[PDB]
Amino acid sequence: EFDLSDPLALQKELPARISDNDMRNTISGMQKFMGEDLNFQERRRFQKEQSREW
Amino acid sequence: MREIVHLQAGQCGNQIGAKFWEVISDEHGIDPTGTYHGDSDLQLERINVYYNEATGGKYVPRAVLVDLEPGTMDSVRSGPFGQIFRPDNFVFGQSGAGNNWAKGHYTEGAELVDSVLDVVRKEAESCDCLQGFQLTHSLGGGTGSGMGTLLISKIREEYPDRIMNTFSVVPSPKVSDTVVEPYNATLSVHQLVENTDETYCIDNEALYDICFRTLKLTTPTYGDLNHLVSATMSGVTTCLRFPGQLNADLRKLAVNMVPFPRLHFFMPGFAPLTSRGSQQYRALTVPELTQQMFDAKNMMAACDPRHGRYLTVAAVFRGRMSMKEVDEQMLNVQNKNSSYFVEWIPNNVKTAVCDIPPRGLKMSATFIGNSTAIQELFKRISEQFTAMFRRKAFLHWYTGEGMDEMEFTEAESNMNDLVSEYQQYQD
Amino acid sequence: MREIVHLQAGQCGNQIGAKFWEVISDEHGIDPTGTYHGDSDLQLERINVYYNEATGGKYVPRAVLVDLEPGTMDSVRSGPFGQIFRPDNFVFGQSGAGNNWAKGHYTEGAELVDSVLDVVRKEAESCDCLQGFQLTHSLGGGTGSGMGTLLISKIREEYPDRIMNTFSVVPSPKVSDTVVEPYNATLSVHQLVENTDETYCIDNEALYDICFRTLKLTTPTYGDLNHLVSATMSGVTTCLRFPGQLNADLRKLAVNMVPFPRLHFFMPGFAPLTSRGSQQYRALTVPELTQQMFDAKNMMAACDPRHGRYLTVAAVFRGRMSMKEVDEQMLNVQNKNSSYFVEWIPNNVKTAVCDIPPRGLKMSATFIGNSTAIQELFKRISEQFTAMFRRKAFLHWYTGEGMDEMEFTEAESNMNDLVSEYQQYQD
Amino acid sequence: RKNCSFSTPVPLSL
Amino acid sequence: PLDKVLEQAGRHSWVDITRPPTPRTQGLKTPPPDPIGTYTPACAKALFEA
Amino acid sequence: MRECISIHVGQAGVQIGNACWELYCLEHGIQPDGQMPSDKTIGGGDDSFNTFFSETGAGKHVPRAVFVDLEPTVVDEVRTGTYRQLFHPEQLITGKEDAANNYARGHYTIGKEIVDLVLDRIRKLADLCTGLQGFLIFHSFGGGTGSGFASLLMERLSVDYGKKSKLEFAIYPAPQVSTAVVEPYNSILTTHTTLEHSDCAFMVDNEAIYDICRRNLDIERPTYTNLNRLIGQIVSSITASLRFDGALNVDLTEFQTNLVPYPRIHFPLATYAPVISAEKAYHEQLSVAEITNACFEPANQMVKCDPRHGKYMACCMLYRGDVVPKDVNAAIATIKTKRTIQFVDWCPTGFKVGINYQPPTVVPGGDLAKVQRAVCMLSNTTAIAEAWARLDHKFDLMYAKRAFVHWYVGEGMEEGEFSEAREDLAALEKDYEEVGVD
Amino acid sequence: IHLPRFSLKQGMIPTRYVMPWKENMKFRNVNLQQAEACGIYAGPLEDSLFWGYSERLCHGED
Ligand SMILES: Nc1nc2c(ncn2[C@@H]2O[C@H](COP(=O)(O)OP(=O)(O)OP(=O)(O)O)[C@@H](O)[C@H]2O)c(=O)[nH]1
Ligand SMILES: Nc1nc2c(ncn2[C@@H]2O[C@H](COP(=O)(O)OP(=O)(O)OP(=O)(O)O)[C@@H](O)[C@H]2O)c(=O)[nH]1
Ligand SMILES: Nc1nc2c(ncn2[C@@H]2O[C@H](COP(=O)(O)OP(=O)(O)OP(=O)(O)O)[C@@H](O)[C@H]2O)c(=O)[nH]1
């Protein structure tokens, strides 16, 4: 198991959060959360939409 | 083989257990419908400590849901995972709670205690050998305390040889919503200390502070809080489920956790909590885990143990680690604050490493703690109790229920006895 | 390995630190995005002295920006390199300075010192071993001096075994804009000499004269002035991170610089400054560097040391040089003006040679000086204090703040002690 | 909308 | 700044423990042994046995 | 013939053991199936394995060991490992309940029901065995299940079988690292129980094992796999005289007779000299002299005792590989001339030399060095009493403030036995001091 | 039997209090000896000065 702490292990460091659309990030992962709000701006956009028509 | 059955009590536990179970199901790869997707052999091996085998590879949750208001169960039953839940496990009453502790403890419980006892012993006979049980409820909740205090009292005697895990949330110090809640809290906690061996204390305000601190998403749901606390509850349970050279038994933990019986209140602690850009700005290393792992801001349970002293500390590490980094980090933290622990015991650290990373991240950990910070908690409930009982505010309900002030006299004396119990060891 | 963490203090220091960090980033060849382009091995080797390594070949700066007014950090954030700075390090308050020393020293800092201590110790725990710290601020700055006196004190008891390097700019002697600045300067400088060990003295007017003398470009920007001080502050720091037979430790230098504890104030000096046509008119030779190095038109710190004598002199040469040139140049200057040194110490020269040239020019140098030319500085500030304390003008604010006239009494006496101390040692 | 279906007991299940 | 205060406070020979405090040097004597004031008796012993 | 039996109590004692046969199976060329190549080595079980494995007419090398455990997790995963076919199914004794780090739980609650079954294994192993010089006991002092169960089994095997050797091997408690505060409880409990019955108890401490890794092996991040590797070649070296011959062969009986000076104390210290990284072996040279200097260098010992703070009684060196009588005898003669090393005035000679022709081999996918000449240093000194001295002031306080006693008395124990162990210990230091006095 | 007795109502009083005499650990024991060396008050284990927006005296609910 040569790896352990290799001298260049950072080059081998793969983030857990390369992007929001990543396969490994599942529900059991706290990094993938659900109260996180990309919808916040979407709420903002549609709050403007609804308010106007209201 | 040794397994666990869960109890979902109180209307909070209705959200608590619901989120708690679905995290487990999503962790182990079972569909909402129930037909398990065979994907991981190891989680295929040890599901029987919590779930039984039904027809066609459906893994039934072994928990019993009890409440009074049907609407809560209906939403729980009609939730994303109520179909995996059993109406066999749905026991309830046909009366209104009123959020009265005595009603659920003397009036409403009396005709439901027989029914729930029959259900649980049937589930007890369904399984072979248990470690014990665990309970999602609250100390300040009308039904949950009322049913919980009843059930903890009864479950003590028939199986006096198992693990009586308890999980209760402490209401917000700034506002309790319910004004008789401190009466309900004092009534519940008086019996709680007499029965329980393990207890988790959780506060909503700190979770909101954590939301302000690392979540940084302004507006979460209470379910989002449920998701956080479930992960802590999941993390402690990952010990038993998963392989790796870590000693998982709560009794293995309990003997290392508490030196004297009266210490049953234990506080949680969790590992990497991250913000918007910092997921890709974090060098995920055991040091920075450990630094964040021991942060006064990383605390969520009751209040800052900066005020008090550290009696026993136990951190379980989930992921691909090694015995040495945790060893030196244990040295580093020991040298960092050698005085900040109690001189009563040296080497008060208990470490475990789970080699199986969670599903979504690799480097993770959980903490269970017992420090001298709970004095802030029951001091608050004390002078609360003083002011109301001094002029017996909100009392005719319980006398109408048949409750007398003498019951409270030993309740406060028992609590104030525990007040002496902490410091005189500590100071 | 030993490293350094920087503090970006005051509203000028925010301005200054932005330039100093981008100069370092450009010197090492990191893009403004953060993806280091591997070009020089030696700068690849010795960046950990200042920058920690983030994910993806990113070298996170180990500096902390602090202020009160939201205008600055956003402009700093919206700069070409604000993306490289961490919002974790962006700590600030929600009040207006009023350019008040006491507010920054007693009122506003008090609820902010707690957080900044946490930030630095988190950064301190992130590192292993430090030489010390360096701070950028101004002596007459309302918040920089207000917090700086606080912050230097806190790190004094926290780590009394490190480098309390300070980088401060004295305001214009002819006029100071801030009328309470001499009160701010005199109060702040009192605590500095107690706590500081190194002090760089920089004056704006000399930079304008340097702009008049060698820049010759009429209208620069203030950042261009920051370019100069960043180049100089980088130049002194070139010793540590570059190879070549020069002993770089500030302690190595300080023991060569400080014969007595009260010697804290040191003046900078720099090497070839070139005008419009002189770039293609200059034959770069160690003699003409040395002459221009010891030019009365080359100074930028305070004033002419012609009025006094020279206590200690130390110039670090950056580029492809050798002893035989510096030796004779060192001999020549001693033969040039032997009497202008003090008879107390002979051979007051300390020489270090950095073999690694800068990026753009080959032969360069920096100078740090101890000459009896600071008396004019604090005797100047002396009459101002008396000229404003005889009728206690502009004093009602600080009494409302909680300042009493006695605090002034010992403070000025402390500088008055320095007046004799500098005078008596030389005269 | 509350799916008031499970609430029905056997005598009152419709 | 300890250096200035100790000499400006009055008493020149601060006893230096060993150094004989000259009968003239004793100036501002510390307040009588008192716990409430900033002369709690615990310190008073320490100097004596020192 | 010339054989012995291995017993592994506790999940601490198993992974270290699992490495041993993983190591052992290589030098014999054992295939994971349990069968040799087409080469003819099978029989009734009589070849190099006959002392180690049982490759009878069935043709399957059956290890002569019983793993005893209380938790199915770790024992089952190795029953799903790579050599699980080799291992006899019920030899790998497990349990469904733990001792919860309690000595008494495994010693009283669960010990009675389990020991008979392994005693059944013991005698069925005993009946097939022929010479069975002794046993190989691998345990741990800070044993959650190792401590209590090892003591009880050692009681029953001692009472029924008292005429052979009992070889004990446990990880010594870390002097400054404690993963459990109940560890001092059962550790001294184990020691006082084991003093009057154990034949030869050998300890080791993992901290110094780690210290070597980044010293000369240059590994800042080793593992159990490496940790079990280093202790694994240690027991391989002591068993080299068994598997291979040499200029002279030595046996456990000679070890016990020559090592232990006086009753009670039978606790020597092991060391392995040619510990070095891969390349560090390459551009350098190995000979007897430097390794003879290295073997006695104080920082190469795995127990946190300064040899100058003690005095030597016994020292046994086991040379495995290509060595000659000439260099070694002069080298040790120069050693006897050394002044800093302080053997007790009692013994003019205190050295037991074992010469084995066979060079130690590397393991495929390993991290050891390329050793041609190796030596194992089993030594006993008086610098060891500090370890128990460390434990007693650790124990005397916590017993006076009687932490966690409510568990032990709550499960049915009392304080008199805890009272016994301390003067059982307190005798041990004063006895170590009286003998330490010449 | 002793009972808590507080003062009247204020407006800018804080809810909570810290009392570093009993809220210091670095010098925890040290401040303890002077608690009786002066004898101000130890009394009940669990006292504060500000219960919630309320004043009292030094004698903790006695
Ligand atoms: N489910 C749920 N419970 C909450 C929430 N916020 C606070 N709680 C508290 O959790 C406590 C425990 O719930 P229960 O024990 O079921 O309460 P109860 O017995 O029905 O009586 P009540 O306190 O009136 O609800 C409640 O008293 C609430 O104060 C929330 O968002 N969801
Ligand atoms: N931004 C900026 N500051 C300057 C400039 N020239 C001089 N300064 C001075 O740098 C000093 C240090 O800034 P700070 O320490 O942050 O000042 P402060 O505490 O916020 O209060 P003030 O000094 O009154 O601004 C200021 O007092 C300015 O007078 C300039 O060109 N730009
Ligand atoms: N021998 C050995 N010890 C280990 C290993 N890894 C860790 N240890 C140490 O050995 C100790 C194991 O003792 P115990 O935990 O009491 O083992 P046990 O009694 O068999 O039962 P458990 O408590 O379930 O492990 C731990 O405290 C570790 O410090 C290992 O691989 N081998």
PDB file of N, CA and C in Angstrom, chain B residues 303-308 372-373 375-376 379-380 383 426-427, chain G residues 13-26 28 31 45-56:
ATOM      1  N   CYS B 303     -24.090  24.531  25.130  1.00  0.00           N
ATOM      2  CA  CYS B 303     -23.412  25.804  25.339  1.00  0.00           C
ATOM      3  C   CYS B 303     -21.915  25.521  25.340  1.00  0.00           C
ATOM      4  N   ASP B 304     -21.119  26.586  25.362  1.00  0.00           N
ATOM      5  CA  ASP B 304     -19.681  26.448  25.173  1.00  0.00           C
ATOM      6  C   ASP B 304     -19.054  25.784  26.390  1.00  0.00           C
ATOM      7  N   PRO B 305     -18.392  24.633  26.236  1.00  0.00           N
ATOM      8  CA  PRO B 305     -17.632  24.062  27.359  1.00  0.00           C
ATOM      9  C   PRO B 305     -16.406  24.878  27.724  1.00  0.00           C
ATOM     10  N   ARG B 306     -16.144  25.975  27.007  1.00  0.00           N
ATOM     11  CA  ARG B 306     -15.129  26.933  27.427  1.00  0.00           C
ATOM     12  C   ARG B 306     -15.370  27.387  28.860  1.00  0.00           C
ATOM     13  N   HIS B 307     -16.639  27.512  29.250  1.00  0.00           N
ATOM     14  CA  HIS B 307     -16.964  27.911  30.613  1.00  0.00           C
ATOM     15  C   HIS B 307     -16.565  26.844  31.625  1.00  0.00           C
ATOM     16  N   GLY B 308     -16.689  25.569  31.265  1.00  0.00           N
ATOM     17  CA  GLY B 308     -16.445  24.491  32.205  1.00  0.00           C
ATOM     18  C   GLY B 308     -15.202  23.666  31.938  1.00  0.00           C
ATOM     19  N   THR B 372     -18.432  20.015  31.988  1.00  0.00           N
ATOM     20  CA  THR B 372     -19.204  20.814  32.937  1.00  0.00           C
ATOM     21  C   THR B 372     -19.720  22.077  32.251  1.00  0.00           C
ATOM     22  N   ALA B 373     -20.721  21.866  31.396  1.00  0.00           N
ATOM     23  CA  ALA B 373     -21.450  22.955  30.760  1.00  0.00           C
ATOM     24  C   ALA B 373     -22.949  22.825  31.000  1.00  0.00           C
ATOM     25  N   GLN B 375     -24.426  22.749  33.759  1.00  0.00           N
ATOM     26  CA  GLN B 375     -24.852  23.631  34.842  1.00  0.00           C
ATOM     27  C   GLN B 375     -25.622  24.826  34.305  1.00  0.00           C
ATOM     28  N   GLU B 376     -25.193  25.366  33.163  1.00  0.00           N
ATOM     29  CA  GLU B 376     -25.938  26.451  32.535  1.00  0.00           C
ATOM     30  C   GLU B 376     -27.354  26.011  32.189  1.00  0.00           C
ATOM     31  N   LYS B 379     -29.457  25.244  35.604  1.00  0.00           N
ATOM     32  CA  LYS B 379     -29.653  26.494  36.329  1.00  0.00           C
ATOM     33  C   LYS B 379     -30.800  27.278  35.718  1.00  0.00           C
ATOM     34  N   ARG B 380     -30.833  27.367  34.389  1.00  0.00           N
ATOM     35  CA  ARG B 380     -31.908  28.082  33.719  1.00  0.00           C
ATOM     36  C   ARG B 380     -33.253  27.480  34.085  1.00  0.00           C
ATOM     37  N   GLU B 383     -34.222  28.518  38.064  1.00  0.00           N
ATOM     38  CA  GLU B 383     -34.843  29.795  38.396  1.00  0.00           C
ATOM     39  C   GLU B 383     -36.122  30.017  37.594  1.00  0.00           C
ATOM     40  N   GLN B 426     -16.329  18.350  40.099  1.00  0.00           N
ATOM     41  CA  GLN B 426     -15.539  19.197  39.212  1.00  0.00           C
ATOM     42  C   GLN B 426     -14.698  20.201  39.998  1.00  0.00           C
ATOM     43  N   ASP B 427     -15.346  21.063  40.771  1.00  0.00           N
ATOM     44  CA  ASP B 427     -14.619  21.993  41.625  1.00  0.00           C
ATOM     45  C   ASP B 427     -14.287  21.328  42.955  1.00  0.00           C
TER      46      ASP B 427
ATOM     47  N   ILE G  13     -30.969  46.468  31.721  1.00  0.00           N
ATOM     48  CA  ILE G  13     -30.333  45.334  32.380  1.00  0.00           C
ATOM     49  C   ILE G  13     -30.150  44.192  31.386  1.00  0.00           C
ATOM     50  N   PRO G  14     -29.067  43.421  31.478  1.00  0.00           N
ATOM     51  CA  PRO G  14     -28.948  42.219  30.644  1.00  0.00           C
ATOM     52  C   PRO G  14     -29.734  41.058  31.233  1.00  0.00           C
ATOM     53  N   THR G  15     -30.029  40.070  30.385  1.00  0.00           N
ATOM     54  CA  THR G  15     -30.691  38.857  30.857  1.00  0.00           C
ATOM     55  C   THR G  15     -29.758  38.002  31.706  1.00  0.00           C
ATOM     56  N   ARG G  16     -28.545  37.760  31.215  1.00  0.00           N
ATOM     57  CA  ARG G  16     -27.635  36.783  31.792  1.00  0.00           C
ATOM     58  C   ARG G  16     -26.398  37.445  32.383  1.00  0.00           C
ATOM     59  N   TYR G  17     -25.623  36.650  33.118  1.00  0.00           N
ATOM     60  CA  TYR G  17     -24.406  37.120  33.760  1.00  0.00           C
ATOM     61  C   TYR G  17     -23.408  35.968  33.823  1.00  0.00           C
ATOM     62  N   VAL G  18     -22.137  36.307  34.038  1.00  0.00           N
ATOM     63  CA  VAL G  18     -21.053  35.346  33.868  1.00  0.00           C
ATOM     64  C   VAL G  18     -20.335  35.075  35.188  1.00  0.00           C
ATOM     65  N   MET G  19     -20.082  36.129  35.967  1.00  0.00           N
ATOM     66  CA  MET G  19     -19.474  36.063  37.292  1.00  0.00           C
ATOM     67  C   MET G  19     -18.156  35.295  37.239  1.00  0.00           C
ATOM     68  N   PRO G  20     -17.097  35.879  36.679  1.00  0.00           N
ATOM     69  CA  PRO G  20     -15.835  35.147  36.505  1.00  0.00           C
ATOM     70  C   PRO G  20     -15.163  34.705  37.797  1.00  0.00           C
ATOM     71  N   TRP G  21     -15.593  35.221  38.951  1.00  0.00           N
ATOM     72  CA  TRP G  21     -15.168  34.659  40.227  1.00  0.00           C
ATOM     73  C   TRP G  21     -15.441  33.167  40.300  1.00  0.00           C
ATOM     74  N   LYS G  22     -16.579  32.720  39.767  1.00  0.00           N
ATOM     75  CA  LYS G  22     -16.870  31.299  39.646  1.00  0.00           C
ATOM     76  C   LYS G  22     -16.821  30.841  38.190  1.00  0.00           C
ATOM     77  N   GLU G  23     -16.369  31.696  37.273  1.00  0.00           N
ATOM     78  CA  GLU G  23     -16.295  31.365  35.852  1.00  0.00           C
ATOM     79  C   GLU G  23     -14.879  31.624  35.343  1.00  0.00           C
ATOM     80  N   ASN G  24     -13.895  31.090  36.055  1.00  0.00           N
ATOM     81  CA  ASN G  24     -12.533  31.050  35.540  1.00  0.00           C
ATOM     82  C   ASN G  24     -11.988  29.675  35.875  1.00  0.00           C
ATOM     83  N   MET G  25     -11.272  29.064  34.934  1.00  0.00           N
ATOM     84  CA  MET G  25     -10.701  27.743  35.147  1.00  0.00           C
ATOM     85  C   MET G  25      -9.182  27.775  35.252  1.00  0.00           C
ATOM     86  N   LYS G  26      -8.519  28.629  34.471  1.00  0.00           N
ATOM     87  CA  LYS G  26      -7.068  28.765  34.507  1.00  0.00           C
ATOM     88  C   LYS G  26      -6.587  29.045  35.921  1.00  0.00           C
ATOM     89  N   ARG G  28      -8.986  28.751  38.558  1.00  0.00           N
ATOM     90  CA  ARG G  28     -10.224  28.334  39.205  1.00  0.00           C
ATOM     91  C   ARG G  28     -10.010  28.127  40.694  1.00  0.00           C
ATOM     92  N   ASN G  31      -8.961  31.362  42.912  1.00  0.00           N
ATOM     93  CA  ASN G  31     -10.037  32.236  43.369  1.00  0.00           C
ATOM     94  C   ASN G  31     -10.887  31.568  44.443  1.00  0.00           C
ATOM     95  N   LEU G  45     -24.456  26.352  45.276  1.00  0.00           N
ATOM     96  CA  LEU G  45     -23.545  26.076  44.175  1.00  0.00           C
ATOM     97  C   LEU G  45     -23.844  26.954  42.969  1.00  0.00           C
ATOM     98  N   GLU G  46     -25.130  27.186  42.720  1.00  0.00           N
ATOM     99  CA  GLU G  46     -25.624  27.579  41.400  1.00  0.00           C
ATOM    100  C   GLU G  46     -26.335  28.927  41.517  1.00  0.00           C
ATOM    101  N   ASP G  47     -25.569  30.008  41.382  1.00  0.00           N
ATOM    102  CA  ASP G  47     -26.122  31.350  41.478  1.00  0.00           C
ATOM    103  C   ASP G  47     -25.573  32.215  40.355  1.00  0.00           C
ATOM    104  N   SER G  48     -26.383  33.168  39.912  1.00  0.00           N
ATOM    105  CA  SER G  48     -25.947  34.249  39.043  1.00  0.00           C
ATOM    106  C   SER G  48     -26.450  35.576  39.594  1.00  0.00           C
ATOM    107  N   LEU G  49     -25.913  36.662  39.043  1.00  0.00           N
ATOM    108  CA  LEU G  49     -26.355  37.998  39.415  1.00  0.00           C
ATOM    109  C   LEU G  49     -27.547  38.475  38.602  1.00  0.00           C
ATOM    110  N   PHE G  50     -27.633  38.082  37.335  1.00  0.00           N
ATOM    111  CA  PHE G  50     -28.711  38.503  36.449  1.00  0.00           C
ATOM    112  C   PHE G  50     -29.475  37.255  36.034  1.00  0.00           C
ATOM    113  N   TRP G  51     -30.653  37.029  36.619  1.00  0.00           N
ATOM    114  CA  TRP G  51     -31.424  35.848  36.226  1.00  0.00           C
ATOM    115  C   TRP G  51     -32.019  36.042  34.835  1.00  0.00           C
ATOM    116  N   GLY G  52     -32.952  36.978  34.707  1.00  0.00           N
ATOM    117  CA  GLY G  52     -33.305  37.519  33.414  1.00  0.00           C
ATOM    118  C   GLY G  52     -33.891  38.898  33.591  1.00  0.00           C
ATOM    119  N   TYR G  53     -33.257  39.901  32.982  1.00  0.00           N
ATOM    120  CA  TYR G  53     -33.644  41.297  33.149  1.00  0.00           C
ATOM    121  C   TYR G  53     -34.054  41.613  34.584  1.00  0.00           C
ATOM    122  N   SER G  54     -33.327  41.062  35.556  1.00  0.00           N
ATOM    123  CA  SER G  54     -33.709  41.194  36.956  1.00  0.00           C
ATOM    124  C   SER G  54     -32.460  41.342  37.811  1.00  0.00           C
ATOM    125  N   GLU G  55     -32.577  42.121  38.882  1.00  0.00           N
ATOM    126  CA  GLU G  55     -31.520  42.359  39.852  1.00  0.00           C
ATOM    127  C   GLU G  55     -31.800  41.568  41.123  1.00  0.00           C
ATOM    128  N   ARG G  56     -30.738  41.266  41.866  1.00  0.00           N
ATOM    129  CA  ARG G  56     -30.881  40.768  43.231  1.00  0.00           C
ATOM    130  C   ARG G  56     -29.696  41.265  44.050  1.00  0.00           C
TER     131      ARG G  56
END
